[PDB]
Amino acid sequence: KPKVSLNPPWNRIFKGENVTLTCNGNNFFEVSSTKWFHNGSLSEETNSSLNIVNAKFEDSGEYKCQHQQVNESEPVYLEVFSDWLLLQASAEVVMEGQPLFLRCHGWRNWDVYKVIYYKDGEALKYWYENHNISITNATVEDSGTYYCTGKVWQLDYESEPLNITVIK
Numbered sequence: 001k002p003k004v005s006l007n008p009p010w011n012r013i014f015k016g017e018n019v020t021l022t023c024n025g026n027n028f029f030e031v032s033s034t035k036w037f038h039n040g041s042l043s044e045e046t047n048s049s050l051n052i053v054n055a056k057f058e059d060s061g062e063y064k065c066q067h068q069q070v071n072e073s074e075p076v077y078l079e080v081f082s083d084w085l086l087l088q089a090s091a092e093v094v095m096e097g098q099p100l101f102l103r104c105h106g107w108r109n110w111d112v113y114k115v116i117y118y119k120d121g122e123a124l125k126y127w128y129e130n131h132n133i134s135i136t137n138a139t140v141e142d143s144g145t146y147y148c149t150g151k152v153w154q155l156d157y158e159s160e161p162l163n164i165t166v167i168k
């Protein structure tokens with residue numbers, strides 16, 4: 001029962017960024033003879049850590065790994081974007097009680113100001129120099145559709161909305 005982890009945790013990234021898919025727990029552990037399936041098609045890498053450089057739209061997809069005598073892992077979907085702002089989430093579905101992290105991410109990692117996170121059309125938090133909103137113990141009320149606004153350079157921009165569910 002293998003589980004694909006990501007680092008950064010962000011599973012929605014901008015074009016050109018880099019992310020690493022570890023076929024297990026911590027990056028302190030290593031292993032050989034691992035299988036990667038991007039969109040179902042077997043990959044050419046075997047290292048348990050499958051890196052991804054200058055993300056191309058084609059990198060968007062369903063990924064999973066498997067071992068010599070083990071059933072393949074639950075798939076993980078990575079989506080690549082091109083836009084001024086991207087709302088990132090630790091996890092899109094969360095079990096009542098777990099942590100939840102949202103991050104208003106600016107293109108090319110630039111800086112964003114006058115940031116405001118929105119939940120269900122309502123203003124929620126506001127900061128000059130942006131900050132990633134975080135939650136330790138998650139309520140079920142926190143489920144909702146988020147999106148953030150911010151000013152980049154000197155213009156205002158709105159992000160794609162993102163639904164989030166907290167089950168119990």
Ligand SMILES: *[C@@H]1O[C@H](CO)[C@@H](O[C@@H]2O[C@H](CO)[C@@H](O[C@H]3O[C@H](CO)[C@@H](O)[C@H](O[C@H]4O[C@H](CO)[C@@H](O)[C@H](O)[C@@H]4O)[C@@H]3O)[C@H](O)[C@H]2NC(C)=O)[C@H](O)[C@H]1NC(C)=O
Binds near residue numbers: 058062
């Ligand atoms: C595994 O399956 C995935 C399907 O979910 C594949 O991802 C899809 O990949 C295609 C091709 O890169 C991507 O389409 C892109 O190509 C368009 C023309 O080149 C480009 O214009 C699109 O982006 C822009 O245009 C659309 C329409 O106006 C906008 O909606 C976009 O926001 C943007 O402005 C686009 O990038 C698909 O989008 C992408 N699907 C998803 C859900 O992202 C993987 O390629 C496949 N893996 C492999 C290796 O085959």
Ligand SMILES: *[C@@H]1O[C@H](CO)[C@@H](O[C@@H]2O[C@H](CO)[C@@H](O[C@@H]3O[C@H](CO)[C@@H](O)[C@H](O)[C@@H]3O)[C@H](O)[C@H]2NC(C)=O)[C@H](O)[C@H]1NC(C)=O
Binds near residue numbers: 016017018053054
């Ligand atoms: C994702 O990882 C890759 C690779 O580690 C990073 O790409 C690197 O990008 C720099 C540009 O910042 C490249 O070097 C620069 O090239 C220009 C022009 O050739 C030169 O003027 C600079 O002085 C510098 O040498 C570098 O080649 C490239 N590395 C590789 C291996 O391709 C990338 O930055 C990472 N993504 C992010 C968002 O950081």
Ligand SMILES: *[C@@H]1O[C@H](CO)[C@@H](O[C@@H]2O[C@H](CO)[C@@H](O)[C@H](O)[C@H]2NC(C)=O)[C@H](O)[C@H]1NC(C)=O
Binds near residue numbers: 027028047049050
């Ligand atoms: C092969 O996978 C290992 C992890 O299993 C990757 O190793 C990490 O590499 C960085 C430097 O690139 C080290 O600082 C880390 O300590 C390493 N971690 C471990 C667990 O050894 C390695 O990058 C992968 N190799 C390739 C070419 O993708």
Ligand SMILES: *[C@@H]1O[C@H](CO)[C@@H](O[C@@H]2O[C@H](CO)[C@@H](O)[C@H](O)[C@H]2NC(C)=O)[C@H](O)[C@H]1NC(C)=O
Binds near residue numbers: 163
């Ligand atoms: C996020 O979920 C919301 C509902 O919580 C979706 O919005 C509504 O979806 C229902 C589905 O039939 C429609 O009747 C409403 O008109 C939708 N409202 C709006 C303003 O779109 C929303 O589509 C979901 N978004 C994603 C990305 O799944």
Ligand SMILES: *[C@@H]1O[C@H](CO)[C@@H](O)[C@H](O)[C@H]1NC(C)=O
Binds near residue numbers: 001071
């Ligand atoms: C492993 O896969 C087999 C079928 O290939 C399935 O019967 C079995 O339940 C799986 N292992 C676990 C722990 O579920």
Ligand SMILES: *[C@@H]1O[C@H](CO)[C@@H](O)[C@H](O)[C@H]1NC(C)=O
Binds near residue numbers: 096097139
């Ligand atoms: C922790 O989570 C449980 C349910 O998941 C809830 O009853 C409790 O109030 C939460 N703690 C806080 C501070 O919200």
Ligand SMILES: *[C@@H]1O[C@H](CO)[C@@H](O)[C@H](O)[C@H]1NC(C)=O
Binds near residue numbers: 101103131132134
């Ligand atoms: C918030 O964003 C910063 C980028 O400067 C990042 O280093 C940090 O890990 C993020 N914080 C959280 C709680 O994820």
